[PDB]
């Protein structure tokens, strides 16, 4: 996964089933060490994006114009953003959002 020093940026990519990408909201989730899975943000096929309260404008979502990929652009990263990040659709609970293949984000202090 991506590792940065505090204050840094990192762009993540989520490739998901094309049928899902075309029709359903895609959520980004994260899970810090020893903590529970939490929902970070979502994006719909029309590029309406929602964010959880802890995002505070720092993370933004977009959809690729040609492929079945959603991007999470992160700025102003802090050590407490260290977590494995995941994406999913059609979750029945927030816990389900961290059940797939994730990527480790590490933010080290300065």
């Amino acid at each position: 996964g991506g590792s940065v020093q505090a204050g840094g940026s990192l762009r993540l990519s989520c490739t998901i089933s094309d049928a899902i990408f075309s029709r359903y909201a895609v959520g980004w989730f994260r899970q810090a060490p020893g903590k529970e899975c939490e929902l970070v943000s979502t994006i719909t096929p029309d590029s309406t994006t929602t964010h959880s309260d802890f995002v505070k404008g720092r993370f933004t979502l977009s959809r690729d114009n040609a492929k079945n990929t959603v991007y999470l652009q992160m700025h102003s990263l802090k050590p407490d953003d260290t977590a494995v990040y995941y994406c999913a659709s059609r979750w029945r609970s927030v816990s389900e959002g961290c059940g797939g293949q994730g990527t480790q984000v590490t933010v080290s202090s300065a």
Binding site: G1, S13, T15, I16, I20, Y71, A88, R90
Partner: peptide
């Protein structure tokens, strides 16, 4: 049906 997971990586 149920949850569909994407695959997350560094872009």
């Amino acid at each position: 049906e149920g949850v569909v997971h994407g695959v997350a990586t560094v872009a």
